[PDB]
Amino acid sequence: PGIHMQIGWRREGIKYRRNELFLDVLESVNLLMSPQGQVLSAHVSGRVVMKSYLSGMPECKFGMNDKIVIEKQQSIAIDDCTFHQCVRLSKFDSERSISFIPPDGEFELMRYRTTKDIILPFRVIPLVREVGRTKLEVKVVIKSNFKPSLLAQKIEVRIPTPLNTSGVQVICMKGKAKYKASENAIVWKIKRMAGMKESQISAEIELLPTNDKKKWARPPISMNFEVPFAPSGLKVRYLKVFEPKLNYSDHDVIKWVRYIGRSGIYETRCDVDEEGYSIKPENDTKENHFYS
Template structure:
């Protein structure tokens, strides 16, 4: 994947040069120095010259870390590797120009371990440190901080776990100093808890666009399964979802659930068609492909276990029916009905419907059956709010938008932004995804644990045209 790797000082001095492919000339580093470092107009982190592409990041110690590729490589994977390499350099005390000059052999040893024929093979600090002749200057408690900083601070997993452990210290028997590196880079040995617990949160965001005639133009759900584990030892977790037999195979029935575009799709009773599944590195992908079960040895604390995308057989939580007409040539009349379609035993909270009005509007006469509603002039919109919205209920709104004096509203020239809805529903799945079972085992011993599963549905771009 990589043909060469360079590390420059802030002013452009070449400190480290590792050529993986012989096809890269020695002068390639000079090209980058001239084209990027000495060119103040360049702001992009990627530069392509002919068949050669330079990906670069700047480390916290003001070092230019540059990857050279001469093939159609994955840019996202290269940048992830560069950030991980920056974190490793910082962990081994090679975070500045002076340290790198004094101990450049450690840097070359590190590159030999993490790169194999130009392909990143191992960037986990605990695993790399066991193979190095020099141990990292960072303490054991700071190892995870370096790892998370490799993604620019966006993947803040272990600090959250440390926070959770601090809040439940009374139920925690293990000591951070008792942890030792294991063969599994994302989990330490020697973890012990008085009470073993697993928290699974299935979070979904549904986006939908409804046309003026009521047909559904697009609808999809983006979901994540987030896990928080407080488990002793080295447990193996296994759970299953009600997904279809294959993420790429359609449902067995030939009748499409969305044949009638005006019909509201019904949830899949038995299975859900998952698309674009992405898993944490701890998941055994072969088990998922063969047995449709998710097997993994979890990290300690909170982490994002899985991402998925669903487009078919969705549970629509709300139906909005708008009727907007020009009234007496100088005002607009709104008749909006909102109906909840989820079970009556559930309640949505923080429900907010935003109804756009023309920018010439100075006042609105509003009448609603329930909730709080007001005209917000600075947003050119009517905001209809419900602190709680019961399932299988219906509410209506009547409003008249009044323009400025001596002016008329031209509804034909108005862009008519769609109405948008925001909401949050606990224990409701827009996709119909359900965790069928969750087991934890560790060898032959009887493993006791408590599991908590929560479903949370939120609105994405939930929009209705009129």
């Protein structure tokens, strides 16, 4: 008369020398924008990734800024949500609670979709004034829209060029830029850029008009960037833990949180053991922490 629960995704007797967990919030923000700035199309697809280095059978509870925020007065509006099997869905439907017993090591806790209240990290404003059939004048400004303390990185703006181009001279003060004729685009790279900033690029584009009477469609300005926050607005409120056999809780745990927002289609038009103890697995930016 005693039933033995056996979780298919977590063995028993897991031991870590130090109880700790990792949370990676990985979002791709996509956009189609008009030259004037009208949002024609936008969505974020995100996923919370978790690396559990916890001992025993910990009973966790993931807390974010959902529509429980609407009860206590920034948030994330989740259109669609899919969970790992470990997540009790019963509780999520009754109380919006993401409770679970995590697998050992890395697992994807949830993926999601978002279309409203997206923090669009960048706006591109393009001008193209034709000045004769000889020349084209191109002015492209990029506005960063996030906290000034924060830095976007690995930025690349691909401004398309028309096929009938004999050559182009370009100038920018921030970053570096090359006209890659093979590509049919001037490619503009900036290493870092803080929030609430401007930056301009000007390109005098000389034309060779052989064809006449036909102006064909051209690709839009596409941007790549990496941003240290969730463009959906996702903020991790807590990761509560309770393991009643070993009597330890989140107060006895180190939680490591990271946000990696990355551009998607952002377009604008013109474990092992040893002695019982499990071992953490291991190209990434190095930071000296006391407990690392």
